[PDB]
Design a protein around this ligand. Structure first.
Ligand code: B12
Ligand code: B12
Ligand SMILES: C[C@H]1O[C@@H](n2cnc3c(N)ncnc32)[C@H](O)[C@@H]1O
Ligand SMILES: C[C@H]1O[C@@H](n2cnc3c(N)ncnc32)[C@H](O)[C@@H]1O
Lengths: 327, 327
């Protein structure tokens, strides 16, 4: 009867898109007086993480996950239909980072907030920066919460924080890209960071009660790190052109997968540099290496790919040299 | 009253993210014995299109639409929780086209089918080709329904049809990209085409009962049209490099223009692929009026198209006449 112990039966149904028994479990816990926050964190988010890990281990496909993610959204919808109305005044706007389509991160977070009596509008997946600030303005938002699932979205989170400051609004950030403490968040000028709803509820309720001062001076970022971000396309696509004159010829699917991986590589590298945390790049190499290992595609390809990136990457950002000379 | 007459009050709530009253309308109609299909088509789909048009007229932002789209998803979820189990055997797999993220087209369609007693798995937004086919295989899907909201996704729908054929599975297609008849669909090798669920229900129920022959011959397509598809990024990004030596732009504007030019080459390529000029002509009309309501001078796009000319015809000389048609 702990939410955690229901992950397996939930997944059994969720992975094949069998919504009804899986949302029934969700609602049975709720009716047995389990706090919603726990249901969301310990069952739904935990299940979704396991889906992601199975995909990652090449034990599931995107088709399975798509179904699992729909069931998760249906569970959140069911839960939301049980909620009493907001007890707190002051609208919190929850947004995925621009470029980020993990709507469910924003939605799970925002729903946990709702369950603490917050008035919450979840934009979910990627919205233009200027459209988010304009929404804050029109909807009289107290606070912006930005949910970021990969560190490759950081440049835009920084820009978004800046735009929000220009209109007086404070930004809390979170989700897995920001790690287990506030160092990455602080490096981008976020007014706050938290790991989950419990803490964010304190910060947000505090921003409602006492609307804090916000810089309006943009947080300093390494320009070379940003130029390396901007160039990720060019470097990847140009790396893949050479290589296929012809040191590995690769079908149209394989060339696109490689190209896509190398764009990601340069973006993790740029992100590591931007917020001065080497582990972002090192964790990516570990991550991708094992992604490919379960998929029986020789890693001479990616090695060759990284090899190719070397000369052009350092031409843009020489400070990335040292990051590359571990791998 | 009729579902159609509730569009305006539905939107009033949906566009500001006020889920509960808007989902309640959908459930009130259902309690008043209104068929689900009608609710979905006449209220939900109708509202979502009007959201689209307000966005298009620059009267709404993507932030407001994201709210409206969440409400629509929650409405479908509520309605789905009222359905009895399937009365029909034989699994229909509903997928957005690869590259297409309009999950709600697939979901609205699939849900109308469910309401006719079909067993349905909605993959929704973009899934890799080989993951869709592997799902069909593992789940023993009778039929694939592909939902396509832009004609720039056609090459991959063709590939997908081909993969489905290799495993003996028939494909119906639909969604707004396929127009008012079956000509575009047929040109890509689809085994059938329909406007909505009512017709597709007849075709699908017929495929369950009498399992049809499927061509293990790929539908013929012009390679130059495909090479022009493949090159869209290169041509756009390279067109925008020239033009900014310097005929006129901030980092936002350069990216918007670049993105519009990738679209231009893809609508052009799509028009060529299925031999329907109107795909490209409709796009020019569409984009021209998109920008007009946004007060961004159309000298820029003109100049952009102008720039594409030399490279585009170098790849596909058969596009020349389509380009000179315009201005
Ligand atoms: C489903 C899923 C997707 C779905 C999302 C669908 C949807 N509607 O959301 C789709 C299909 C879009 C997808 C696409 C991709 N994703 Co994905 N996928 C996931 C999965 C399984 C997450 C789904 C989810 O439900 N998240 C919601 C829950 C589980 O998140 P949470 O972190 O528990 O949220 C809590 C806390 O973070 C906190 N919190 C969250 N936000 C905020 C905000 C604030 C302010 C605060 C205080 C707190 C807070 O509170 C929440 C309380 O519940 C994960 C697995 C994972 N996250 O471990 C990946 C994962 C994030 N995806 C991944 C990848 C790689 C991809 C793709 C690049 C794959 C590809 N296409 O080739 C794309 C990128 C798309 C993009 N640009 O955003 C990787 C990232 C790996 C890495 N960084 O090295 C992951 C980790 C999977 C993996 N490898 O294990 N993905
Ligand atoms: C909401 C929305 C989005 C959302 C969708 C979120 C979601 N689905 O969860 C998001 C934000 C993802 C989005 C993004 C974009 N979209 Co959009 N947006 C829409 C909108 C408003 C979709 C509304 C929706 O709910 N669709 C479901 C309903 C309304 O669809 P329906 O067509 O009635 O479906 C029925 C029939 O077609 C049929 N049917 C449907 N599928 C199938 C399949 C089969 C097999 C059969 C037999 C029948 C069938 O039965 C259905 C049920 O009755 C439309 C507006 C519109 N459709 O006119 C655009 C629209 C499709 N989007 C558009 C654009 C431009 C974009 C973006 C390019 C914006 C951008 N990046 O700049 C991107 C493209 C993303 C991509 N696909 O890769 C344009 C396309 C323009 C064009 N020239 O083709 C539209 C038309 C808006 C407009 N009026 O300009 N979009
Ligand atoms: C992180 C999640 O993204 C999904 N995923 C991985 N690659 C793609 C893709 N090309 N398109 C759509 N979804 C994808 C998987 O289901 C994984 O679990
Ligand atoms: C076609 C639909 O897509 C949304 N839309 C338009 N541009 C973007 C973008 N850059 N990011 C996300 N959504 C967008 C609008 O809400 C519109 O209605």
């Amino acid at each position: 009867e702990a939410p955690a112990s229901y992950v397996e039966p939930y997944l059994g149904d969720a992975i094949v898109g069998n919504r009804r028994p899986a949302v029934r479990l969700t609602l049975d816990l709720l009716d047995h007086r389990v706090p919603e926050a726990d249901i969301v964190e310990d069952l739904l988010a935990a299940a979704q993480r396991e889906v992601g890990e199975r995909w990652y281990r090449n034990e599931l496909s995107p088709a399975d996950e798509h179904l699992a993610s729909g069931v998760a959204g249906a569970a959140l919808d069911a839960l939301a239909a049980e909620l009493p109305p907001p007890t707190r005044d002051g609208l919190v706007v929850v947004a995925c980072a621009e470029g980020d389509w993990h709507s469910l991160s924003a939605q799970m977070f925002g729903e946990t907030l709702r369950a603490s009596g917050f008035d919450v509008s979840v934009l979910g997946a990627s919205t233009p920066r200027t459209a988010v600030v304009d929404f804050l303005t029109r909807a009289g938002g107290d606070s912006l919460a930005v949910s970021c699932n990969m560190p490759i979205f950081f440049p835009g989170v920084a820009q978004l924080i800046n735009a929000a400051h220009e209109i007086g609004v404070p930004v809390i950030v979170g989700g897995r890209a920001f790690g287990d403490d506030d160092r990455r968040a602080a490096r981008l000028g976020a007014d706050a960071w938290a790991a989950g709803a419990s803490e964010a509820a304190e910060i947000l309720a505090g921003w409602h009660a006492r609307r804090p001062e916000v810089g309006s001076e943009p947080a300093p970022l390494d320009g070379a790190a940003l130029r390396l971000f901007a160039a990720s396309s060019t470097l990847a696509t140009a790396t893949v052109d050479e290589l296929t004159a012809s040191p590995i010829l690769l079908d149209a699917d394989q060339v696109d997968q490689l190209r896509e991986h190398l764009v990601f590589a340069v973006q993790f590298l740029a992100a590591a540099r931007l917020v001065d945390d080497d582990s972002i790049f090192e964790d990516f190499l570990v991550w991708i290496d094992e992604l490919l290992r379960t998929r029986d595609v020789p890693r001479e390809v990616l090695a060759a790919g990284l090899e190719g990136l070397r000369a052009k990457v350092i031409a843009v950002d020489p400070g990335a040299t040292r990051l590359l000379d571990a791998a």
